[PDB]
């Protein structure tokens, strides 16, 4: 049903949404402890966080996964 | 619990490329920014557990399928 599709889309990638919030801090923590340059680490994270964000599944990916699960029958 | 395993298999497969690409993206980003091939490998391989610990795992797929109604609590 459509209700079941909405619910699947709401929770399927929840683990990624949780983690995405902490990626900038974690990247900064890793960088600073290794490269020890706060200024350069701030630049690294700002310039390259977008690459990780692009790996986080989006709502369209949730739809397609939930279709694979058989719950989203709609195309979108 | 075949439906549970089906659900987890699907989620784990949907996540796999992002899971495997996360450390590679950091490695590629490091090479493009800090340049040093030697120190970039060390950085990624042993010095960013804070970031790699954030990558979802099978246990998270299980809990997701629990939320969906097809898996029991682990
Ligand atoms: Zn089983």
UniProtKB/Swiss-Prot annotation, chain B:
Residues 1-74 form a propeptide. Residues 1-74 form the Saposin B-type domain. It comes from the Eukaryota. It is found in: Secreted, Extracellular space, Surface film. Disulfide bonds join 4-71, 7-65, 30-40. Glycans are attached at residue 16. Homodimer; disulfide-linked. Pulmonary surfactant consists of 90% lipid and 10% protein. There are 4 surfactant-associated proteins: 2 collagenous, carbohydrate-binding glycoproteins (SP-A and SP-D) and 2 small hydrophobic proteins (SP-B and SP-C). Pulmonary surfactant-associated proteins promote alveolar stability by lowering the surface tension at the air-liquid interface in the peripheral air spaces. SP-B increases the collapse pressure of palmitic acid to nearly 70 millinewtons per meter. This is Pulmonary surfactant-associated protein B. It comes from Mus musculus (Mouse).
